[PDB]
Design a protein around this ligand. Structure first.
Ligand SMILES: CC(=O)N[C@@H]1[C@@H](O)[C@H](O)[C@@H](CO)O[C@H]1O
Ligand SMILES: CC(=O)N[C@@H]1[C@@H](O)[C@H](O)[C@@H](CO)O[C@H]1O
Ligand SMILES: CC(=O)N[C@@H]1[C@@H](O)[C@H](O)[C@@H](CO)O[C@H]1O
Ligand SMILES: CC(=O)N[C@@H]1[C@@H](O)[C@H](O)[C@@H](CO)O[C@H]1O
Ligand SMILES: CC(=O)N[C@@H]1[C@@H](O)[C@H](O)[C@@H](CO)O[C@H]1O
Ligand SMILES: CC(=O)N[C@@H]1[C@@H](O)[C@H](O)[C@@H](CO)O[C@H]1O
Ligand SMILES: CC(=O)N[C@@H]1[C@@H](O)[C@H](O)[C@@H](CO)O[C@H]1O
Ligand SMILES: CC(=O)N[C@@H]1[C@@H](O)[C@H](O)[C@@H](CO)O[C@H]1O
Ligand SMILES: CC(=O)N[C@@H]1[C@@H](O)[C@H](O)[C@@H](CO)O[C@H]1O
Ligand SMILES: CC(=O)N[C@@H]1[C@@H](O)[C@H](O)[C@@H](CO)O[C@H]1O
Ligand SMILES: CCCCCCCCCC
Ligand SMILES: CCCCCCCCCC
Ligand SMILES: CCCCCCCCCC
Ligand SMILES: CCCCCCCCCC
Ligand SMILES: CCCCCCCCCC
Ligand SMILES: CCCCCCCC
Ligand SMILES: CCCCCCCC
Ligand SMILES: CCCCCCCC
Ligand SMILES: CCCCCCCC
Ligand SMILES: CCCCCCCC
Ligand SMILES: CCCCCCCC
Ligand SMILES: CCCCCCCC
Ligand SMILES: CCCCCCCC
Ligand SMILES: CCCCCCCC
Ligand SMILES: CCCCCCCC
Ligand SMILES: NC[C@H](O)CC(=O)O
Ligand SMILES: NC[C@H](O)CC(=O)O
Ligand SMILES: NC[C@H](O)CC(=O)O
Ligand SMILES: NC[C@H](O)CC(=O)O
Ligand SMILES: NC[C@H](O)CC(=O)O
Ligand SMILES: CCCCCC
Ligand SMILES: CCCCCC
Ligand SMILES: CCCCCC
Ligand SMILES: CCCCCC
Ligand SMILES: CCCCCC
Ligand SMILES: CCCCCC
Ligand SMILES: CCCCCC
Ligand SMILES: CCCCCC
Ligand SMILES: CCCCCC
Ligand SMILES: CCCCCC
Ligand SMILES: [Cl-]
Ligand SMILES: [Cl-]
Lengths: 329, 329, 329, 329, 329
């Protein structure tokens, strides 16, 4: 039906003349995973192309579109899109190549394929884990400059659809939209580039329950010492030491999961402030013990330091929490 | 025998006319693995197709079906099924492609292949680990709409068989069955979709023995303090502190295995209630020590608080367990 | 030499007539790994096929066998064996495909290839780690029923050889042998199936030294308490608590390595019995302390409980060990 | 257009005569990851080739360059570059091969491709983590010696461009530049080799906060003992022991992450010196207890050892830190 | 130039007559990694072949060798070497297949390729980590017996070269050399086999510092108890218990890294002897406490046991170390 043997498909339509326009639209099937250690995400989508080539015209009386097997895609000419700044990708091939080709009697062509991509995304963790991130996926032609191929969104802002099943267990997904920009390479020229943009927001419940509550409970345990007879030395000393030693484990367990950045995160501040709060309660009792021994040496109830600590330590911690949650909201 | 050189197999049977019907049936060989962190499962199965094409007719006197090598599959026309919402898949190829082709003298065709698939499954962990999940595998044609191809289960509900060897170490598998539904894509049209459905139920014995028993034993250890002379301060203080510090480790060891969901699970409730039960026994003795020191200061047996705690703490824990196992059964 | 252009190799020898017999023999090169979490093993072997096809006859005066390059395998007809219930496999291809083809002047053919397979194996862990497992590898034709192809072991029981280098660090390997059985699929018919069977036995030394000895040592540490003055409360209390808290870690470290089965293993019994032995020694001293305080209240040496515990606890543990190693031998 | 059927492209241009010159230039897209355990890095780049072949001449009036599909690359002759000392690499192929071919009417050719490489890099950890590393990527022709192919940087030092987005979370990247050298293989001859060089510098903030601070805090905790009444034996003994036991965990947690080198690293020195500082404070109190018991035996305030330790231990640690940070800056 | 269309390259040179000799030589580029858990190593090398075939003769006046593209390798005949007892391998293919072909006017051929291999190696850990291992890589023809192909090292012992960059962070590499042996398969015949042999020696510094020193320090901590007043029960009891409990962690941390062998390693002996040394110091004080209580009961300084332990325990440990390092050197 299609006159495939007649023509040299190594050359584009309009070869030697003005640029060929090619339109694009997209449907996202899933957003698959995200990594902070590697700074990347994975996405699966359907991608579609539109153009006209009169070498693929055929006669009919119905003026309708026809579908063809799919093994003809490797005989005709086809555009050459690639994903910019991507780590890896593939096209699906079970039970056969997931490819579709439809042609109109005047030579208009529709071409579609299903693909999975993993792409680069630079992340900022200064407000972690109360953070927000923004991402994009880039599309461009490899071989042809804007003097030979013209690339655009087919229907404007309506060119992007999203599956209603899309979900991530740790993030809220929002603000899908599309943009365009021109790009330059020194050795080869100017190119059109298409963008798909979106925003992510992290859920905090896991981190409350797994980090912020136990640190608070250790701080509250250290306060119990102020309520115990100053004469019970082998009770008051280990009570403080054990809380110091636990707070160290919590600090280690948090930071072992993240990338080794060169700046402080919002969770680090909270944990290290709680550490100094616990550390100071040990020096307090050391002072009380020394001053009591001096009194014994002079001579040979509740001490004022205990009496004041019972008020001062909790008030200070409450002030710190008010400030912190005013800053990070 | 088969006139393969005579015809253009880029076009379907009945091209330009009414839709071709294609029937399907399936046998599941194994259900291979399941992930909560990734929310997916893996399955291996045999998949079969049935249709008629008169371009593949041949003469004989016996009216019987014949089997052909398998290298002819890439010369003739073949339907184009794909698995919807799937992460990855392949066809087996040792010692050769695991493919079968049988043809009748009137052009009826039987086509079979062996495949492994990994597929998406959304999971709810609010009753974990006493939870039940339901899953499905989706089948659809990539290129042809319901105006060109008609897809149906060959024998109705009898179209699905299951291997007697199928098993999972952590789940009971039940309720295999098949359904159909129509699907719409904005840019390309209407399609028939086939479903395979099943249900999973988790075994709880591992979690009893590995989580619920040790937390109970820590709670029962904290009660021993009420039976010890109030004068033995360096004994009664560490006995409580060490149980608090162990309960924290159990809490951490559980949640380090699961996805970071934004809601509380049924096991979290039990562990955090046990934590507060243990935490309170430390404040109890702090109160007894303070009140004894006040009595000493005034002046200068078993305390009522101990006497009452010996009854109140165990009764409250038993009430809590009755309620909990009434709710989660 | 071979008349390859003359014939249609899409059709088997004797197409349209009685079944073709095909003989098989095997040499195992290595048994590569085993997984309890995944319930599978990996094997590498050489696999050989024997049949006659008169379309491959050629003239000679010597009546001897000749070897051919190997690129002819994709032109002639070849049998279609696959491994049943397998997870994955491949054929080796460095520096070229590891394939061999030899032909006799009357058309007798010998065909060989090297392959690696990973296969399913259901395992029972009720006597773990003193357990024994049995495994098998299954071989069958994909497309041809017993009416068209007949599959058998070439030399009877002599058809299976094993490399003298085969070894596993954790198991003793024994009892290699071969069997045959007929198989039925509802939609497609009856098939011949060949089996390779073997047995595995686990070495226990690692588990003695890494699990059973330290649990025993914790139990023996708990007994030291009975030998210490009942007046040293802050010594006798932590001595018991610390052993409870260590035994919990041993229990956790064992079960974190295995699949989450729904039944008790032989190592679980030992560890949980040792746990209760240690748990009881804490209640013992609690009783002694309470009864001493009652005597003080009445009034205002070694206690009989200590005196009896010094005999009763070790005797009971020794009785338990005699029974256990009588049952699991 | 191009006379591809006319010529034998198994032979290079100028076959049997002087060497063909081939020029190269490069743009780096990303530096992807680095491993100390494996001693390697990963890089993604665009690579370009320039040469003339008169068998690819064609007539035109415009004297301009033309772009061709890309399926012609496997028909014509093309240079054979490989990456020396590399572990693995691939060329990107979605949605098609990422390859470009441009030709001028006189037969000048431009050839480009996108690739990812993982390459060997020998590392020195004697000043870890205050260390600096230098790396390079090597390029060479596989089959042709300098008598048949001549390989050079196209534009001198201007032949290397770098993407402005390039970043690593743990390193500062600096000093990109290019060099050339001749290489010899005994069996096959002399070859031209091109180099791409760069330098890396590690950020230290993570290691301060995660290793050096907690070790210092343990040392400062051990000093508190000198301020406590020498009569409180069950307080002063555990205070020292627990710090020894914590310092061991820090030492283990650091070295579990790195390769098992045969020499001491700069972080090892700090940690083991802090260990001996803590170890000595236990022997100190042992001495005080023994000497006090001797005084009791003779007979039957603050001891001079405590009085002097309160000054000597901190001064010594401060001297050690001054020296250390003078050496490692 | 080469008459490729004239001949049947499915047949070897001298087909039907005496065996063809094929010579080999090798250059090792890198030794990439080693695993004790899997018992294997990985190697990358260049491999070369030499033979004569008069079907590849061509006329010239210069009598020199010529290089050809590399796409002709799949048209001519080529030998069929494979690596015996190997787990996996591949040939490098970026930017093209890393293959070289050179031919002389009389039909002498040189063939080269670059490859990476992973190979089996049986290891003995009875003297671990002071152990020495020996390894080899095996080379053989798949399809042709010694009656049809003759395989030998081209230049004798000079056939093996090694890159000066080769290094491993944990081993000293020594004693590279080559051997030959004949091999028999029951079903198929006799074959020539080539060997590459080498030796490895482990560096011990990591294990000194990470295992042997801390165990010694725990033993020395247990001795401090003998220097403390026998009346300080809550000090002397935990001092011993905590060292027992730490030594258990060291024992576990070592053996969690290695394969689960059925025999004792040299490091196990040291650690378990140190364990009993620490265990005995607890029974010592238990005895002293009991005997003191008996003296109190009779009645109603330093004990001889302490006095003797202060000499006996260290002397015994020093004797043990002398013997151990005399045996394992
Ligand atoms: C759906 C559609 O666009 N149909 C048109 C039809 O209305 C028109 O009469 C014909 C003329 O060729 O072209 C086609
Ligand atoms: C967020 C975004 O890119 N929105 C685009 C925007 O460029 C434009 O303003 C709008 C028309 O009003 O169409 C849409
Ligand atoms: C198994 C089967 O269906 N056999 C039928 C046979 O009964 C019938 O006589 C024949 C007529 O062509 O067609 C075939
Ligand atoms: C569970 C399920 O899908 N069962 C199907 C159902 O649709 C139908 O009701 C039944 C006929 O009674 O056939 C079967
Ligand atoms: C090894 C073997 O079987 N050789 C036989 C030979 O003994 C016999 O004389 C000949 C007749 O064609 O066939 C061949
Ligand atoms: C273990 C096993 O399968 N052995 C087979 C068996 O079937 C048969 O009894 C024997 C002949 O005596 O040949 C062999
Ligand atoms: C951009 C460029 O180099 N253009 C030149 C043009 O200036 C010159 O007149 C012509 C002669 O053939 O060759 C071409
Ligand atoms: C760092 C480096 O390689 N720089 C090169 C160098 O070889 C040369 O000195 C310079 C010219 O001044 O060109 C550039
Ligand atoms: C390098 C070498 O071997 N060159 C020889 C040359 O000496 C000899 O004169 C010629 C005769 O054909 O063969 C060639
Ligand atoms: C270690 C080794 O294999 N060395 C070989 C050896 O077989 C032989 O003794 C020597 C000649 O003296 O050549 C070399
Ligand atoms: C880490 C040094 C701690 C010193 C404590 C001094 C207390 C003095 C009380 C007057
Ligand atoms: C965490 C603060 C604990 C305060 C305990 C107060 C006890 C008062 C007893 C009357
Ligand atoms: C967990 C509850 C423990 C109760 C101990 C009671 C001892 C009574 C001795 C007569
Ligand atoms: C590890 C041996 C410790 C010995 C301490 C001796 C102290 C003597 C004080 C005079
Ligand atoms: C594990 C049993 C320990 C028994 C200690 C007995 C000491 C007796 C001293 C005479
Ligand atoms: C102690 C944790 C407090 C968490 C407050 C969160 C406010 C949104
Ligand atoms: C940008 C630094 C914020 C630090 C705030 C500290 C709140 C107590
Ligand atoms: C302490 C755990 C109790 C578990 C009860 C389970 C009831 C089915
Ligand atoms: C849906 C919340 C259930 C909480 C029940 C608490 C049982 C003590
Ligand atoms: C305490 C462990 C005893 C192990 C006995 C094993 C008997 C074969
Ligand atoms: C099948 C259960 C065996 C339990 C034996 C217990 C031995 C003390
Ligand atoms: C206690 C850590 C001190 C770190 C000093 C770093 C100086 C650049
Ligand atoms: C090259 C060894 C440096 C050691 C310096 C020690 C500083 C206290
Ligand atoms: C305490 C460890 C001693 C190590 C001695 C090593 C002798 C080569
Ligand atoms: C082969 C056993 C060696 C054991 C030596 C023990 C040294 C104290
Ligand atoms: N748009 C792709 C680039 O032009 C590739 C290159 O720079 O070679
Ligand atoms: N049924 C497959 C879809 O039609 C693919 C697409 O939307 O392009
Ligand atoms: N023996 C292979 C089976 O017949 C395959 C199938 O059931 O389709
Ligand atoms: N430049 C590549 C080397 O010549 C390859 C080999 O030595 O065979
Ligand atoms: N040398 C390879 C072996 O002959 C292969 C086989 O035994 O089939
Ligand atoms: C940005 C610095 C914050 C530090 C608070 C301790
Ligand atoms: C004390 C916690 C209050 C924080 C409110 C955001
Ligand atoms: C759904 C909330 C339950 C919380 C019980 C503490
Ligand atoms: C106290 C446990 C009983 C729960 C019964 C389901
Ligand atoms: C099979 C049950 C055994 C349980 C022993 C405690
Ligand atoms: C007490 C251990 C003896 C067990 C013998 C099998
Ligand atoms: C290079 C040796 C340094 C050791 C310092 C303790
Ligand atoms: C005591 C820390 C000072 C180090 C300055 C580099
Ligand atoms: C080979 C046995 C050695 C055991 C030493 C305790
Ligand atoms: C006490 C350690 C000496 C060992 C010498 C090899
Ligand atoms: Cl005490
Ligand atoms: Cl204590």
């Amino acid at each position: 039906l299609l006159r495939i043997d007649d023509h040299d498909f190594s050359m584009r339509p309009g070869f030697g003349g003005p640029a060929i326009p090619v339109g694009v639209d997209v449907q996202v099937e899933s957003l698959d995973s995200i990594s902070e250690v590697d700074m990347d995400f994975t996405m699966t989508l359907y991608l579609r192309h539109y153009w006209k080539d009169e070498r693929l015209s055929f006669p009919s009386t119905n003026n309708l579109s026809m579908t063809f097997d799919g093994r003809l895609v490797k005989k005709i000419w086809v555009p050459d899109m690639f994903f910019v700044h991507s780590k890896r990708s593939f096209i699906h091939d079970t039970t056969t190549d997931n490819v579709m080709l439809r042609v109109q009697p005047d030579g208009k062509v529709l071409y579609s394929l299903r693909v999975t991509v993993t792409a680069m995304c630079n992340m900022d963790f200064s407000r972690f884990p109360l953070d927000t991130q923004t991402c994009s996926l880039e599309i461009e032609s490899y071989a042809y400059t804007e003097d030979d191929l013209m690339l655009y969104w087919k229907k404007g802002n309506d060119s992007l659809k999203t599956d209603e099943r899309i979900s991530l267990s740790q993030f809220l997904i929002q603000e899908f939209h599309t943009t365009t920009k021109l790009a330059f390479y020194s050795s080869t020229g100017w190119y059109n580039r298409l963008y798909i943009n979106f925003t992510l927001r992290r859920h905090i419940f896991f981190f409350l329950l797994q980090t912020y509550f136990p640190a608070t409970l250790m701080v509250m345990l250290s306060w119990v010492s102020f309520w115990i007879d100053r004469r019970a030395v082998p009770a008051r000393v280990p009570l403080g030491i054990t809380t110091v030693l636990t707070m160290s484990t919590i600090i280690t367990g948090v930071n072992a999961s993240m990338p080794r950045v060169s700046y402080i995160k919002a969770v680090d501040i909270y944990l290290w402030v709680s550490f100094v709060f616990v550390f100071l309660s040990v020096l307090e009792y050391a002072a009380v013990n020394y001053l009591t021994t001096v009194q014994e040496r002079k001579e040979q109830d509740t001490h004022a330091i205990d009496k004041y600590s019972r008020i001062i330590f909790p008030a200070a911690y409450i002030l710190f929490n008010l400030i912190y949650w005013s800053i990070f909201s």
